[PDB]
Amino acid sequence: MKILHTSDWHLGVTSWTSSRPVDRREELKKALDKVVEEAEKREVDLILLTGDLLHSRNNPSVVALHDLLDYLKRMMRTAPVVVLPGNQDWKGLKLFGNFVTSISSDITFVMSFEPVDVEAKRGQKVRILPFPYPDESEALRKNEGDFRFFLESRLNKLYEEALKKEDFAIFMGHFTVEGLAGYAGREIIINRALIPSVVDYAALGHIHSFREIQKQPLTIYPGSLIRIDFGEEADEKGAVFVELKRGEPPRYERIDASPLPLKTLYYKKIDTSALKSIRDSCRNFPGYVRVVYEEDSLPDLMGEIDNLVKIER
Amino acid sequence: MKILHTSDWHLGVTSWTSSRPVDRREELKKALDKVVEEAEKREVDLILLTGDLLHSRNNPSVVALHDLLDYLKRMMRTAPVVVLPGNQDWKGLKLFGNFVTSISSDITFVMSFEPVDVEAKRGQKVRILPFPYPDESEALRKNEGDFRFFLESRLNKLYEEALKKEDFAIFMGHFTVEGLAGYAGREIIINRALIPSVVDYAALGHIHSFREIQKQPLTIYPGSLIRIDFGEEADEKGAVFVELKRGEPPRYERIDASPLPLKTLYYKKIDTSALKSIRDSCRNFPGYVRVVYEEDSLPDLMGEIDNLVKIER
Ligand SMILES: [Mn+2]
Ligand SMILES: [Mn+2]
Ligand SMILES: [Mn+2]
Ligand SMILES: [Mn+2]
Known part of the structure; x- marks a missing residue:
């Protein structure tokens, strides 16, 4: 089964507004066009978008929405897509994905810890184990003091559920792992060892730098498609193409976005x-x-x- | 050749001073005592301290200094030690290490890009390729516009020099690699692929979370020995024991600090x-x-x- 995994687009971002507004829309379209054209060429079976597709949490522009929907549409023409919105996707988008999700078996949004089953291009039966952003705001909401006994019970559920997969089980998360502090100078961070070990692939989003987080299970952040501000001079940008075969270890290949x-x-x-x-x-x-x-x-x-x-x- | 690599002690730190001062000295000594006792047991040949041993850049306490010197002394009794001070080590310490470095072949400080050769416990000839913190302050100092053509020329030198090793070449760096942005919500970051590929081990410091950065060359941050503030609920603390053999791939084993x-x-x-x-x-x-x-x-x-x-x- 062939997969395109891409993330953290930030459609509609303009950088350096406090000092010299640069609208990133042209550069960003260049990259997305390259990614999608690549996924058409490889004839992927499934497309995984792990969130932060839009940049504005509260006030996305019409142009931005039009763009996102254009891309979602081109992608659906090539393969079924699964989306895990992130922290910075407009709340209105979650509503639309919830609405469009019932209507079609070619796109499906996942916005809770509840596993959903999906079919890929060629019928492969895929089990999605989602883990949406652990927002400080929805831990105040829930009013459960120690949030971690709760996230842990969820990661357990997803593990018990991955064991009942038919063809493939795929984890989708939007969060930061126990990366690297102290960069000079807060989030609910999730230890990578906590990602259920039995899934065939673990697609992550939220982090802008491509990183191969671990090999078993294969866990990747594909990264942004552009360099958003100056804390990203040295990392890599692009998406990721992943192949999964029942008998075998997973294989993968970056698509570099060729960012400015x-x-x-x-x-x-x-x-x-x-x-x-x-x-x-x-x-x-x-x-x-x-x-x-x-x-x-x-x-x-x-x-x-x-x-x-x-x-x- | 057996190595103890440990880092980022932050001797003298007291946490949460703005809200409820907790002096970390007891917990920290517990861990250091455990690490050193372990290095005595394994009879290591070389000890690598990759910086930030002290916590206060400008005003370290006498108690803190006394402690650091005590530990440096216990360690020297078991094996030769090499220290790469970091950004937050008191400037006075660099002066002392510079002074003590001429006097002994059992301790040696490295504070530039210049390679130095050292002998280990049992005579193994080791080549140290140091890379001190790329401070924004010493890039303003140097007044060379594009600092990166310069760091790159240094990483090249260390590579040309690692190729002339006798027994082992070991890289020591104090910096952040192209880790993971954007954690919500600046440093000169170094891409890990830039660390010379020919060294047998690359010991890093500055990051508080243990991480195995890459396998060839083996590159590790051992992490802190304690959890300094709340951005470190989920990572791992301790030091690292490393074995290098001329014919073979490097092997390693964490010593968990068992932090609160x-x-x-x-x-x-x-x-x-x-x-x-x-x-x-x-x-x-x-x-x-x-x-x-x-x-x-x-x-x-x-x-x-x-x-x-x-x-x-
Ligand atoms: Mn995010
Ligand atoms: Mn993002
Ligand atoms: Mn440091
Ligand atoms: Mn440190």
């Missing part, structure tokens, strides 16, 4: 030398630049350099 | 029910508790519950 790069320039004083360096370093750079400096002054660089998006102290 | 646990309780309103839940949930818990709630009021819980260290909204 980001770069930071560091200076003590903005000298005449610095000005030259900044001008020279931005001139032929195909992406976006931030400069940070230590000692004060300062000319209008952003009026002169189209790709200089941030200047700090 | 942390826990968050979530409530809508602090009711009479909540009060009961909080009281019941803290009563027999061997670690530290934080409660967060949504709607306002509120009694003196911290006067009544010794292990309740934080209350938010």
Whole structure:
């Protein structure tokens, strides 16, 4: 069974609004078009979207919605799709996915801990074990003091249920795993060993950097399709194609999104030398630049350099 | 060759000072004593400390220094030690390590990109390829606009130098790798593929969660020995014992620090029910508790519950 797993699109995002608005819509469409064109070529059987498809939790734009629906539609033409909305998907979208989910067997939204069964392109019977974002807000809501005895009982249920799979069991989560603190300088974090060990694949979303979290069960974050801000100069962007065969270990292959790069320039004083360096370093750079400096002054660089998006102290 | 790799001790830390000071010194000594006692038992050949041994960058306490020196001394009695101070080690410590480094062949500090050679307990000839923290401050200092063409030239040098090893080449770094953003809601991050592939082991520090970053070359963060604040409820603490043999793939084994646990309780309103839940949930818990709630009021819980260290909204 062939799978396209992709995530964390953030449709409608514009970066650096406090300093120099760049609408990411063109770059983002470039990547999504590349991903979808790739999934058509490989003739995948199932498409897994693990959330944060939209960027605005409360006020998505019509353009953004139109886009998302366009893509959902192109994808459905190639294979059945399963969506696990995340923390930053507009609440209205969960309502629509709930409505469209009854109407079709070619798209299906999962918004609870309840497992659902689905058929893929070629009839493969797939069991979805979903784990939506553990929101601090819905732990205050539930008013159960220790939230963890509860998440743990859910991860147990999904394990008991994965054991009854017919063809494949696939876990879908939207959260952060016990990654890496302390980056300088809060979430309900889930330990990766807690993801049920018996599923054939564990598709994650929420993290923007592609990472192969563990091998048994195969657990991946595909990452964003673009670099959203400057904490993402060094990671990898794209989606992931996964193959599952009953007798065998899972195999996978990245589709790199080929995102525009980001770069930071560091200076003590903005000298005449610095000005030259900044001008020279931005001139032929195909992406976006931030400069940070230590000692004060300062000319209008952003009026002169189209790709200089941030200047700090 | 047998190695003890341990890191990120944070000697002298007291947690939750803004809300309920807990001096971590006792718990921390418990762990360090366990680690060192373990390294004596296994009779390791080399000890690698990858930085952030002290907690205070500018104002470490005498007690903290006394402690650090005690441990450095016990360790030297069992095997030669190599230290890569990190971002949060007091500047005075770098001065001392620089001074003590000439005087002895049983301890050696590495504070630049310059490789140094060392002998282990039993004569094994080891090549250290160090990579100290890429501080934003020392990139403003250097005043070289694009810092990355520079770090890259250094990682190249260390690779060219690892190829001339006699017995073992070992990389020591103090930084964050392209981990996982966006955790809700800056550093010079280094991509793990950039760590020279030819070294036999790559010892990292700065990250508090034990993680096996990659297998070839074997790259580990051992993690803290304690859980510093509440962003570390789910990760693992301890040190790492590593074995390297010329013909063979590297092998390793964690020493769990057995740290005191942390826990968050979530409530809508602090009711009479909540009060009961909080009281019941803290009563027999061997670690530290934080409660967060949504709607306002509120009694003196911290006067009544010794292990309740934080209350938010
Ligand atoms: Mn998310
Ligand atoms: Mn996201
Ligand atoms: Mn550090
Ligand atoms: Mn640290």
